[PDB]
Amino acid sequence: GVRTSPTGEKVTHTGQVYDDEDYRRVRFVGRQKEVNENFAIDLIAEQPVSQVGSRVISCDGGGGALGHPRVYINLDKETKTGTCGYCGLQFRQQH
Amino acid sequence: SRGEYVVAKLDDLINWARRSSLWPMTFGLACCAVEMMHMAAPRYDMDRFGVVFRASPRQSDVMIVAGTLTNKMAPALRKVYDQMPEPRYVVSMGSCANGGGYYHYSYSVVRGCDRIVPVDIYVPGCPPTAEALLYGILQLQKKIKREKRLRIWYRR
């Protein structure tokens, strides 16, 4: 989910864009500013909250040894989802 | 116009003759020389592209800097570059020639051969494979293909 400064220069997933009066835009004159158009903070918000029937859930990011270190998430808060600290996936106890 | 067409065909002819007959002068500085020798070896075989094996510096078309450029040899690099007739080209090969590489923070290493000579093609790797060096040489040939010396001369 890219956005654009009033200079026409694209805004990265960090939020970086050069200022209007900054000379360092001259490196993009006649060339392109290479930004990635798949913002991970937008792509992780599209994932469904996984409803599980346990109090403690585990996540390994999928794949087993192809994912991240396996972590355990407590699901005692019904107010809030329990987000995996590595992959950003989030869980909820269904009761 | 007619003269624009004539100088366009003449640019195409002289660019064909200069890219299809590149003669390299290879600086065998370090480990990248071994992979240049594999690019000359029978598998990848530079000679079938018109790229001859070990021409002399006073008639070569491209200086391949292949290996670490130390402080002790940077004037020798610039001197051999100055002895080359024009059009001369420089291919930087591997990380030490490109930016200093694994010896970037060394006291006795020139941090990239583009502090010494003007570099046309940067081939990255440690060492870049002989197939990757050959990719860089073909990209040099494509850069020679889109030169516009006589078109700009007719327009100047």
Binding site: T12, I41, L66, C87 | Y44, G101, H104, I121, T129, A130
Partner: protein, 176 residues
């Protein structure tokens, strides 16, 4: 347990002396060398037709760097800075901060490809398989600063090359 190369005495009967003189006057071993070179004339050469034919590689090959994503679009890198800690060239520069959803992510992930020694300690130090040294070796540039990759270039390398990187990691991760 040792052998003497070049400790043969030549014979001194008239047969072997005439053999050595025939070898001198009739150039027999020079004809042997001509015969070996003539033998290679009538062989198929080892030359592949690059760019249309490619040299054979393995799934372990260490080419151009890329940053991978999970199969949800979330990037794998969680700013732990093991890859710039182990980088023998100090080619990696990382800066991080928590982003808007609280995730531990990088704002700067730079790899100076001209400093890089392409040894792949960053992919084997990475605990989440984020940075990989993928299959691409044909990425020569015409300018020095084009070989100074920021995070956007490496994420575009991951998006460009993920279909091949994931298959190489699938073929190789049981040896790791």
């Amino acid at each position: 347990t040792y052998k003497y190369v070049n400790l043969r005495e030549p014979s001194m009967d008239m047969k072997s002396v005439t053999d050595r003189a025939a070898q001198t006057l009739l150039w027999t071993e020079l004809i042997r060398g001509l015969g070996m070179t003539l033998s290679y004339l009538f062989r198929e050469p080892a030359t592949i037709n690059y760019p249309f034919e490619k040299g054979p590689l393995s799934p372990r090959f260490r080419g151009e760097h890329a940053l991978r994503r999970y199969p949800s679009g979330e990037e794998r890198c969680i700013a732990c800075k093991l890859c710039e800690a182990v980088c023998p060239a100090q080619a990696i520069t990382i800066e991080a901060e928590p982003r808007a959803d609280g995730s531990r992510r990088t704002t700067r992930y730079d790899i100076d490809m001209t400093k890089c020694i392409y040894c792949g300690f960053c992919q084997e130090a990475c605990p989440v398989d984020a940075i990989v040294e993928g299959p691409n070796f044909e990425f020569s540039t015409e300018t020095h600063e084009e070989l100074l990759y920021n995070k956007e270039k490496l994420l575009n390398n991951g998006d460009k090359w993920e279909a091949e990187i994931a298959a190489n990691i699938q073929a190789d991760y049981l040896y790791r």
